[PDB]
Amino acid sequence: GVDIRHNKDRKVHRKEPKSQDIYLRLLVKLYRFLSRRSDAPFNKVILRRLFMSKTNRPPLALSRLIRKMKLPGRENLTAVVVGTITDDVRIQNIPKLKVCALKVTDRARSRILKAGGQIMTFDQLALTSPRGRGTVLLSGPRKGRQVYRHFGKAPGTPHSHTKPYVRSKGRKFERARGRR
């Protein structure tokens, strides 16, 4: 026999979108052809995110997309995001965005188009930019869910700052012995 541990032979990486969506699996059939033959590091990152789940594809608000486009060097590039571009109602101006995403909400689609912008899809992106040139791949706040506020050391340890699971946030709910 051979002295080797088979504990971590399997690499747990999603190699196929767990969704049975038809249009999403067609984009996978498109970017798998580019991840093999285009020889561009952009298509290899879009292919991963087409597999990822909804929690690994968080929304991207307009304000969080506008600020990343106003950085120096993003003059006439595209804002690629594998997910939904939600609207940020507490922002006012839209500076002529050129985005490309799977879904765009009805208000975000209106504010981008009314400002003269352009909204694309991942099939049009692979048509005009097969190498992925002139793109700015963005993402949303993956650690922005309420679920991550409960993850930590423990609610009852020093320097925890972890949100405990309670039925209702009140006075008689876990504030007596250990919180003072």
Partner RNA sequence: AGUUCAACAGGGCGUGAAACCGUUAAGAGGUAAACGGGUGGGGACCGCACCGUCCGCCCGGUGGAUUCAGCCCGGCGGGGCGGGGUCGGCCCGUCCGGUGGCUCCCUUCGCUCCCGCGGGGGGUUGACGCCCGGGCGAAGG
Partner RNA sequence: CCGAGGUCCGCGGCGACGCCGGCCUCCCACCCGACCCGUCUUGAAACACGGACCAAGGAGUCCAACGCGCGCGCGAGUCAGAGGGUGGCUCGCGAGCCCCUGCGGCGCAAUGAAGGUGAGGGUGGGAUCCCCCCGCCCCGGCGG
Partner RNA sequence: GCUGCAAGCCUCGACGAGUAGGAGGGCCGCCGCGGUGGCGCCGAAGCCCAGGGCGCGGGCCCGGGUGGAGCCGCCG
DSSP string over 25-88: HHHHHHHHHHHHHT--TTHHHHHHHTTS-STTS----HHHHHHHHSSTT-SS-EEEEEEEE---
In the window 1-60, what residues touch other proteins (CB under 8 A)?
19-27, 29-30, 33-34, 37-40
CB 62 within 8 A of CB 42: no
> Which of RNA, other proteins, none does 77 bind, CB closer than 5 to 8 A by kind?
RNA
Q: Name the nearest CA neighbour of 65 among 100, 113, 41.
A: 100
Among 8, 11, 13, 73, binds RNA (CB under 7 A): 73
Q: Name the nearest CA neighbour of 31 among 142, 116, 108, 125.
A: 125
Residue 47 CA to residue 24 CA, distance in Å, equals: 11
* Shortest reach from residue 11's CB to other proteins, in Å: 22
Phi, psi (rounded to 5 degrees) for 127: -90, -45
Q: Name the nearest CA neighbour of 70 among 89, 94, 102.
A: 94
Position 108 contacts RNA (CB under 7 A): yes
Position 114 contacts RNA (CB under 7 A): yes
> Which of RNA, other proteins, none does 17 bind, CB closer than 5 to 8 A by kind?
RNA
List of residues contacting RNA (CB under 7 A)? 1-2, 4, 6, 16-21, 24-25, 28-29, 32, 39-42, 44-45, 53-56, 59, 67, 73, 77, 83-84, 86-89, 103, 105-108, 113-114, 116, 131-139, 146-147, 150, 165, 169, 171, 175, 180
List of residues contacting other proteins (CB under 8 A)? 19-27, 29-30, 33-34, 37-40, 89-90, 92, 102-104, 106, 109, 121-124, 126-128, 130-131, 150, 154-157, 164-167, 171-172, 174-180
